[PDB]
Amino acid sequence: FRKPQPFEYEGTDTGVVLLHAYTGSPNDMNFMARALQRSGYGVYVPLFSGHGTVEPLDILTKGNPDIWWAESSAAVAHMTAKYAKVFVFGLSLGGIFAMKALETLPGITAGGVFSSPILPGKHHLVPGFLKYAEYMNRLAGKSDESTQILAYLPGQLAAIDQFATTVAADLNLVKQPTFIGQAGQDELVDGRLAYQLRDALINAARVDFHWYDDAKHVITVNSAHHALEEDVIAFMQQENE
Q: Residue by residue, what is the 3-state secondary structure of 18-72?
A: EECCCCCCHHHHHHHHHHHHHCCCEEEECCCCCCCCCCCHHHHHHCCHHHHHHHH
Answer whether 204's CB lies under 8 Å from 109's CB. no
| Solving technique | X-ray
Q: How far apart are CA 231 and CA 19, in angstroms?
A: 18
The resolution in Å comes to 1.6
- Annotated catalytic residue, options 92, 123, 208, 225: 92
- How far from 165 is each of 26, 90, 131, 138, 237, CA to CA, in Å? 25, 17, 26, 35, 31
Starting from the edge strand earliest in sequence, which strands make up the sheet with 85-90, in order?
7-9, 42-45, 14-19, 85-90, 110-113, 178-183, 207-212
- Active-site residue, 186 included: yes
Q: How far apart are CA 92 and CA 21, in angstroms?
A: 6
Q: How far apart are CA 35 and CA 40, in angstroms?
A: 9
- Annotated catalytic residue, options 51, 210, 217, 225: 217
- How far from 100 is each of 34, 81, 159, 192, 222, CA to CA, in Å? 25, 19, 16, 20, 26
Answer whether 87's CB lies under 8 Å from 44's CB. no
Answer whether 109's CB lies under 8 Å from 87's CB. yes
User: Considering Cα of 123, then 86, then 103, then 194, what sign does the dihedral take?
Assistant: negative
- Annotated catalytic residue, options 186, 208, 225, 231: 186
Answer whether 80's CB lies under 8 Å from 108's CB. yes
Amino acid, single-letter form, for residue 81: A
Domain ranges of the chain: 1-241
- Active-site residue, 92 included: yes
Torsion angle defined by CA atoms of residues 151, 154, 160 and 161, in that order, rounded to the nearest 10 degrees: -160
> Hey, which residues does 234 pair with through a beta bridge?
none
1-241 homologous superfamily:
Alpha/Beta hydrolase fold, catalytic domain (3.40.50.1820)
> Hey, which residues does 14 pair with through a beta bridge?
85
> Can you list the positions of beta strands (E) in 60-199?
85-90, 110-113, 178-183
Exposure of 41 by Cβ count < 10 A (0-12 exposed, 13-18 middle, 19+ buried)? buried
